[PDB]
Structure formats: C-alpha cells, structure tokens
Design a protein around this ligand. Structure first.
Ligand SMILES: Cc1cc2nc3c(=O)[nH]c(=O)nc-3n(C[C@H](O)[C@H](O)[C@H](O)COP(=O)(O)O)c2cc1C
Ligand SMILES: O=C(Nc1c(F)c(F)c(-c2ccccc2)c(F)c1F)c1c(O)nn2ccccc12
Ligand SMILES: O=C(O)c1cc(=O)[nH]c(=O)[nH]1
Ligand SMILES: [Cl-]
Ligand SMILES: [Cl-]
Length: 357
C-alpha cells in the first residue's frame, strides 16, 4: 500500500479522468509513457515471479494487453512501469482511422470501459520502422526476460483476412517474440485455413527471427466454438492462446450510464467470464497449450485466480486506466504475497493448480 498507489488512485487519476475524455486520456498516457514521465517502479521482481514459456523467459508474469500501445510508441516506457512483457497492436496492414468518435466510454461505477475504436492503426510500415529503430535494444530486453508481443489485425475493407494476417507475419514477425491473431465465432475449416497460412508464413522466417504464434479469443464463444478452436490449435501446433478479448455481452448489474454503448466491455465485469474461459480452454487443451489470461485483473488475487485456472502469464489494461502506473507494482507485490501464503514455490507451481484439486 504505497504512497504513490494511494495518491494515483485517490487524487491524480480521478482528476485526470474528470478533465479528459477517455480517448484524450489514452493519448496523453501514451505520450507520458513514451517520454518516461512515470512514478518510480519501486518493486523488484523476485525469482518466484519468473516464468519460462513460449520459448522465452518472462521476469514477471504481468503484461500490458493489446490496445494500449496500438502503434508501438511506448514500449520502453511500459517496461519502465514494471510490466514483464509488452504486447503492441492491433496493427493493420494499411493505416486506417478506425470508427468515428466518440468511441471509448468509461463506466466508473463498474470499474469498466466500453470501446469501439475499430482498429485505428498507423499500419504495418510505420510500426515496422518504429520497432526497427529499437530492435537491438529489444533483443537485450528479451534476453533479460522482457519479451515483446505483436498483435496483428486486418483492414476494414479487406476481402481475405488470411492475407492481411500473412502480411503482418511477414512484416512484424521478425521483430516480435510472439505474434497474436484475434479469432471470433465460427467455420472450423475456415479457422484451420487461416491458421495454416499464418503458421506457414511464420515457419518461413529465419530461426532467430521466428516468433511464437498465439490465437486471442473472445469470451463470447459457444461451447462448440471453444471445442473447435481447441481442436484446431492442437492439430496445427499453435503455440498459445490469449484468453480473453473484450465482451459484447452486457452482464446484468452494470450501473454506468454508458452501459448500452456499442463495443467491447473490459474491466471488472469481464473478470470471471475471462477466468472461466481460461479454465475451459486449459482443460480442452489438456494443459499443454500456454494461456495468457486477461480480463479484469487489478489485484494479486485476480492474477492468481487466472494462473490457478490455467494461465501461464496475465495481462491487464483497464486497471491501468483507473489506478495508473502504480497498479503494476501492486499486482506483482500482491501476487508474490499470495503465492507464499498458499505454499507455492513460484508462479510456475501455481499454473493450472485448480485442475489438480
Ligand atoms: C480501449 C481498448 C482498446 C483495445 N484494443 C485492442 C486491440 O487493438 N487488440 C486486441 O487484441 N485487444 C484490444 N483490447 C482488449 C484488451 O487487450 C484486453 O483483452 C481486454 O481489455 C481485457 O483486459 P482488461 O479487462 O484488463 O482491460 C482493447 C481494450 C481496450 C479497453
Ligand atoms: O489511459 C487512460 N488514462 C491514463 C492517464 F490519463 C494517465 F495520465 C496515465 C499516466 C501515464 C503515465 C504517467 C502518469 C499517468 C495512465 F497510465 C492512464 F491509463 C485512459 C482513461 O482514463 N480512460 N481510458 C479508456 C480507454 C483507454 C485508456 C484510457
Ligand atoms: O480496436 C478495437 O476496437 C478493439 C480491438 C480489439 O481486439 N478489442 C477491443 O476491445 N477493441
Ligand atoms: Cl536462410
Ligand atoms: Cl440500458
């Protein structure tokens, strides 16, 4: 319970959110982060937070989810905040503006956000050049246990999703530790086709520049959809799953005035839907496919619940928007304390632990 955590949560963040609409705040946050104008990250990662998965070392399991740094402008500042890994994107092949404004909405009473950004993206070429500018620094960061993920999207007007994803693999795959493709509800044959093309393109990259490939799913899938995704992921040798994206559901109980805005809902109302999706996907893949768990993480308990359900790593986004940068150290500190309290030697020993009860 540091001075910074309390000051950010009680004074600075509510003040900024009272002055700035969420898209404006998002842009300012990216700018501050890119410049390194950050509170000091006082928490030192202990050994018990280290995870080895996806072919890499992660010095802690708490990452920044896709959609915060869409265009790769703030990667170094995000490591400076204390994140164990950074995922940029989604990046589309051509630049595109996204949906008309307003397109982001806070639900403060719910600790939630709704967004319909619509894959606003600077595009592959711009992002490729930004990452190339710091490619060696990233190599050293990855070696030191701070990997980089790149989430690949598709253009609004594209007629073949597979070709958009293949272009992203070609262009940004050599700059990433892992790539992410978002999948929505089917159909199975179409998913197999798309993922086959992505994997073939990845396998064509030189070994030292060859990333892991993960599939990111929504929580809005039928049981049949989940079954089918699990089958295809195993059949094809997909390296991992990201579980989950935002939800188009609106759980009963939402209080925010903006609850009926179109878009994806994130934060606390998504938390347990995400955790249960992790549990299901872990079981459908027999615990053999690494899962990055994401949706409503703002505490050590939230992180550990996902880890015990089957996540090897977690991400957060919405909590950063409400609590600010100190939330990263908070979640790490709390997670370490809970690991110790529950008798785990480290994160690794807790992964999927609920399934062994
Ligand atoms: C404003 C906003 C923009 C997002 N944009 C993307 C995106 O471009 N690609 C993506 O895969 N997920 C995106 N997401 C989803 C997040 O990566 C994450 O899966 C989701 O918000 C759940 O985590 P949270 O509850 O900790 O925010 C976005 C989320 C938010 C709130
Ligand atoms: O980014 C947002 N807020 C937001 C913000 F305003 C900030 F100043 C920071 C911030 C960043 C660096 C140093 C000090 C504060 C920060 F980390 C943030 F997260 C934001 C928000 O307030 N609502 N929102 C909704 C969707 C996406 C982002 C955001
Ligand atoms: O750009 C967006 O609208 C977006 C993409 C995504 O994958 N998830 C989300 O919640 N928003
Ligand atoms: Cl070669
Ligand atoms: Cl309503």
């Amino acid at each position: 319970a540091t001075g910074d955590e309390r000051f950010y949560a009680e004074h600075l963040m509510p003040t900024l959110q009272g002055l700035l609409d969420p898209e404006s705040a998002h842009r300012l946050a990216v700018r501050f982060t890119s410049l390194g104008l950050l509170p000091r990250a006082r928490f030192q990662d202990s050994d018990m937070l280290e995870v080895r998965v996806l072919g890499h070392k992660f010095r802690n399991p708490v990452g920044i989810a896709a959609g915060f740094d869409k265009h790769g402008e703030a990667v170094d500042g995000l490591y400076k905040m204390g994140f164990g890994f950074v995922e940029i994107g989604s990046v589309t092949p051509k630049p595109q503006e996204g949906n008309p404004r307003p397109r982001v909405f806070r639900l403060p009473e719910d600790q939630a956000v709704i967004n319909r950004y619509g894959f606003n993206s600077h595009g592959l070429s711009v992002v490729e050049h930004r990452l190339r500018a710091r490619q060696q620094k990233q190599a050293k960061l990855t070696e030191d246990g701070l990997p980089l993920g790149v989430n690949l999207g598709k253009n609004k007007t594209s007629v073949d999703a597979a070709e958009d994803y293949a272009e992203g693999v070609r262009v940004l795959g050599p700059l990433a530790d892992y790539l992410v493709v978002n999948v929505s509800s089917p159909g199975k044959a179409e998913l197999r086709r798309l993922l086959t093309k992505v994997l073939q393109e990845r396998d064509g990259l030189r070994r030292v520049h060859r990333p892991a490939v993960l599939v990111k799913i929504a929580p809005d899938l039928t049981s049949q959809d989940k079954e089918d995704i699990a089958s295809v992921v195993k059949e094809l040798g997909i390296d991992g799953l990201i579980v989950t994206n935002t939800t188009v559901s609106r759980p009963a109980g939402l209080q925010g005035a903006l609850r009926s805005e179109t878009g994806g809902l994130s934060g606390k109302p998504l938390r347990d839907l995400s955790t249960q999706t992790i549990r299901e996907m872990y079981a459908l893949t027999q615990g053999r496919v690494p899962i990055i768990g994401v949706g409503g993480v703002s505490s050590g308990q939230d992180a550990l619940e996902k880890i015990r359900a089957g996540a090897s790593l977690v991400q957060l986004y919405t909590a950063l928007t409400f609590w600010g940068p100190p939330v990263v150290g908070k979640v790490k500190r709390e997670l370490e304390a809970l690991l110790k309290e529950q008798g785990f030697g480290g994160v690794t020993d807790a992964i999927g632990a609920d399934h062994r009860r």
